[PDB]
Amino acid sequence: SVPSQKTYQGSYGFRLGFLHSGTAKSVTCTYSPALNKLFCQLAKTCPVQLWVDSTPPPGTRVRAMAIYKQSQHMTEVVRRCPHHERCSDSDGLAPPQHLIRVEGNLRAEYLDDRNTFRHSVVVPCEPPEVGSDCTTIHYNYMCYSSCMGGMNRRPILTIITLEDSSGNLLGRDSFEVRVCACPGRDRRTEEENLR
Ligand SMILES: *c1ncc(Cl)c(C(=O)O)n1
Ligand SMILES: [Zn+2]
């Protein structure tokens, strides 16, 4: 089984947004619109904006899940490598096997799917606060793209789904992720390679 990655704004006009962080050597998280790709350091804050055209119903949730991008690896569950899953970096909520965490949200729930065995993290969809036009979720990625026995240099996609209270699909967006030591440099390199 492979989760859909089809972009779907749905009834509420759901889509993601990203900050403009640049590509300086000091940057820890940066998004490339040209590549639709987030570059980030291990376990560092990744702000992801949620934008809607109209407010979805109370009980709407936002789920994140990783899959492998490449055709020949899409059926394999994305998980932390044998090193990082045994790290003592628990936050009290995320299972140690999960690549994607939500930072600083006590209502985050982590799912180990009983059928597909895939991991995901889900939070309530909060409306924007006063003085803001969007809401932001802070994600952390807990293994490097290069980790042996884990992602093993294989690119991943994060799929963000807007769901109703039963888990039915309301909206979908996605982006590639590279977890790496030098996200600014790697973004510059990959944007050059594309050009
Ligand atoms: C995971 N958790 C803790 C530590 Cl100290 C390490 C490491 O070997 O750097 N990994
Ligand atoms: Zn790892």
From Swiss-Prot:
Known outcome of mutating residue 138 to L: In sporadic cancers; somatic mutation
Result when mutating residue 32 to P: In sporadic cancers; somatic mutation
GO cellular component: centrosome; chromatin; cytoplasm; cytosol; endoplasmic reticulum; germ cell nucleus; mitochondrial matrix; mitochondrion
Effect seen on changing residue 1 to F: In sporadic cancers; somatic mutation
Outcome of substituting residue 156 to M: In LFS; germline mutation
Consequence recorded when altering residue 167 to D: In sporadic cancers; somatic mutation
Reported impact of residue 155 to A: In sporadic cancers; somatic mutation
Disease implication from the record: TP53 is found in increased amounts in a wide variety of transformed cells. TP53 is frequently mutated or inactivated in about 60% of cancers. TP53 defects are found in Barrett metaplasia a condition in which the normally stratified squamous epithelium of the lower esophagus is replaced by a metaplastic columnar epithelium. The condition develops as a complication in approximately 10% of patients with chronic gastroesophageal reflux disease and predisposes to the development of esophageal adenocarcinoma.
Record comment regarding domains: The N-terminal and C-terminal disordered regions undergo liquid-liquid phase separation (LLPS) following homotetramerization and activation. Post-translational modifications, such as phosphorylation or lactylation affect the ability to undergo LLPS.
Name of the protein described by the UniProt record: Cellular tumor antigen p53
Organism: Homo sapiens (Human)
Span covered, complete protein: 96 to 290 of 393
